[PDB]
Design a protein around this ligand. Structure first.
Ligand SMILES: Cc1ccncc1NC(=O)Cn1ccc2ccc(Cl)cc21
Ligand SMILES: Cc1ccncc1NC(=O)Cn1ccc2ccc(Cl)cc21
Lengths: 304, 304
C-alpha cells in the first residue's frame, strides 16, 4: 500500500554520466559504448546563444577541444559529429559500465525518470512526464544540460530525453537521444513560449485507479458517462480528449478494481465540476497526471 | 528553476541489495562489507507473526538456513546474530560494491530516499520523511521488507531506515540499521495505531522559500508575526511547534531571499487561516512538508 511518485533506480545511468567541456562551457555527457552524447550548445559561449550557427561554430573545433572526463579520468576523443542538436564524441574507450540500451522518442503524456547532473556528477533523481505542449516540468539549474531522461524494462535502459534548456517561464525543453527537440523548440536564446499545458486525462484516470487500489474511494460516485459526454467536460477543463485507445490501455486497471472505465470517467467529471471540497486523493489536493496506466500497474505489482 | 520531490541517486545502494530467504520467507538484505542486514521477521512464517518469540525461533535456525543471493550468485553465511529487530548475517565475502557508509538514526521531520526492492532487486526510488508520529508514508508491497532509506553526502551513504511493516492504516513502520524501530512499533501482527500525523512546519517554511526562489510569490503578504503568535495558529492546525532552532536552520533561505523567517511565518499563517483559494504553490494544492531546509538549499544550489 501507499502510492508515491517513484523514479527508476538510477545506477545504470549514473555509470554513463561524464563531464564535457569545450572552451569555457561545461555540461553533462552520456557515455554509451565508445560514444559520448551531449547538447551541441557545449561549443557556444553565452553570447553565441542569441543567434548561433552551429555548423560554422563547429568548424573551429577539433577532437582535442572536447574535454571528456569520466569520474576523474580523461577520455581520449578520436572523432566528433553533429546529429541534429546533439554532438556525438567518439572516444577510444568503450564505457565498461554501458548497460543494455535503446534510444526511444516518447510521446506526450509518457513518463520518465531524470537523473539531474552537474559537472558529470549526479545530484538527484525524479519522475517527469512529457507534457502535451512538449515541455517538461523538471528541476534543472545552469550546468544541468546533458542530464538525461529514461525508462527501464528489467535490464534495458530506454533513453528518451536529454536536457537542453529552460524557457523564460521556468519550464524545460530538450531532445531525444538523436538530437531532435520535443516540440517546436530550438537551441537558441530567443522568445519561445510554450503552448497550452493540458492535463493528461488517461494518466489522471490511472491515478484514480491507483487511489481506489490503495483505499482512497470517497470520489467514487453513482454515475457513469460516455466518451463524448466526458470529452465535452474534458474540453472545458483543458484536459486531453480521451480516446478508445486510452480506454483500452486502462483495461487492466478496470479489471483489477471492477470499476468500468466510463464509471471512473464519471467520477473524474464530478471531480472537475465540483472540485475536491478541501479533501485529498493519495495525499494530493489536485488531480495528478504524471503516472501512466503502466506506471500504476508497475508500482501496484512490484515489477523490478 | 523548477522544484521537484527529488531522491538521491540510488546506484551506491543498488550495489548493496541482496535477497535473503529463510524457510518459506523471502525479503531484502543490505550487504555492507561482509555483513548482510535484514529484518528479523525473515525467520517467521505468517502464522508466527501473531506472537513471535524471536530468540526461540532463532534457536531452530543455523547459518545454512539463511539463503543469501546477490544478483544470481549465492553468498556463504558463516555467522548470524540478532541485534534488536535486525539479523546480521556474516558472509565469507566482503561486498566489492560497498560504498563509504554510516548508520544514522534520524529524527522526525528529516527526509530520506527509499530504494524499494523485491527479491533483492530494485523497483524504484522515492523521497520520504520520518513523520512526527514515526511512521513513513511509503510505497511498499509484500516482499519489500528489508528495503532501505538513506541520505548521501558526496560519497558517504548514511543508512537511516530499513522497512519492516505496514500498519493496518496503510502507513509504514521500520527500524534504523541497528534494528531499533522508529516510534513505538513492534515487529508483531498486532493492533498498532499511529499517533497524530502533524505537519512538519520547518519543512513547509523551507518549501515556501523554495517557491519564492522559483517565482511562486502570490502568497507573500504584508504581515509579520512572532514565534508565540505563529505557534498558537500552528497548534490549531496540527502543525509542529516552531522553535528558535528551526528559525536558525532557515537562516540561509531567509538570507538568500531577503524574507525574514517571521514574515514567512505570517504568510504561512494566512495560508492556514484562508486556504489556497483554488491556487497552487510549486504545482501543489496543499502545503508540502517533506523537504527540509537542507533539501531546499541542496536542490536550489545543485550539490552533487
Ligand atoms: C540556466 C539553465 C537552467 C535550467 N536548465 C537549463 C539551463 N541552461 C540553459 O538554458 C543554457 N542556455 C542559455 C540560453 C540558451 C538557449 C538555448 C539553449 Cl539549448 C540553452 C541555453
Ligand atoms: C504486506 C506488506 C506491505 C508493505 N510493507 C510491508 C509488508 N509486509 C509486512 O508487513 C509483513 N508482515 C505481516 C505481518 C507483520 C507484522 C510485523 C512485521 Cl515487522 C511484518 C509483518
Amino acid at each position: 500500500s501507499g502510492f508515491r511518485k517513484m523514479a527508476f533506480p538510477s545506477g545504470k545511468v549514473e555509470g554513463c554520466m561524464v563531464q564535457v567541456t569545450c572552451g569555457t562551457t561545461t555540461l553533462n555527457g552520456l557515455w554509451l559504448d565508445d560514444v559520448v552524447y551531449c547538447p551541441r550548445h557545449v561549443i557556444c559561449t553565452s553570447e553565441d546563444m542569441l543567434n548561433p550557427n552551429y555548423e560554422d561554430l563547429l568548424i573551429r573545433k577539433s577532437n582535442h577541444n572536447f574535454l571528456v572526463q569520466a569520474g576523474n579520468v580523461q577520455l581520449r576523443v578520436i572523432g566528433h559529429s553533429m546529429q541534429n542538436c546533439v554532438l556525438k564524441l567518439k572516444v577510444d574507450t568503450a564505457n565498461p559500465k554501458t548497460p543494455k540500451y535503446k534510444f526511444v522518442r516518447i510521446q506526450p503524456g509518457q513518463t520518465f525518470s531524470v537523473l539531474a547532473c552537474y559537472n558529470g556528477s549526479p545530484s538527484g533523481v525524479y519522475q517527469c512526464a512529457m507534457r502535451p505542449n512538449f515541455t517538461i516540468k523538471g528541476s534543472f539549474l545552469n550546468g544541468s544540460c546533458g542530464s538525461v531522461g529514461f525508462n527501464i524494462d528489467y535490464d534495458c535502459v530506454s533513453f528518451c530525453y536529454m536536457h537542453h534548456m529552460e524557457l523564460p517561464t521556468g519550464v524545460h525543453a530538450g531532445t531525444d537521444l538523436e538530437g531532435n527537440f520535443y516540440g517546436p523548440f530550438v537551441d537558441r536564446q530567443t522568445a519561445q513560449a510554450a503552448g497550452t499545458d493540458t492535463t493528461i486525462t488517461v494518466n489522471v484516470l490511472a491515478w484514480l485507479y491507483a487511489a481506489v487500489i490503495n483505499g482512497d474511494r470517497w470520489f467514487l460516485n453513482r454515475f457513469t458517462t460516455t466518451l463524448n459526454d466526458f470529452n465535452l467536460v474534458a474540453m472545458k477543463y483543458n484536459y486531453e480528449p480521451l480516446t478508445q485507445d486510452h480506454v483500452d490501455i486502462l483495461g487492466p486497471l478496470s479489471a483489477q478494481t471492477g470499476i468500468a472505465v466510463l464509471d471512473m470517467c464519471a467520477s473524474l467529471k464530478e471531480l472537475l465540476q465540483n472540485g475536491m471540497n478541501g479533501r485529498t486523493i493519495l495525499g494530493s489536493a489536485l488531480l495528478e497526471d504524471e503516472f501512466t496506466p503502466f506506471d500504476v500497474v508497475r508500482q501496484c505489482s512490484g515489477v523490478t
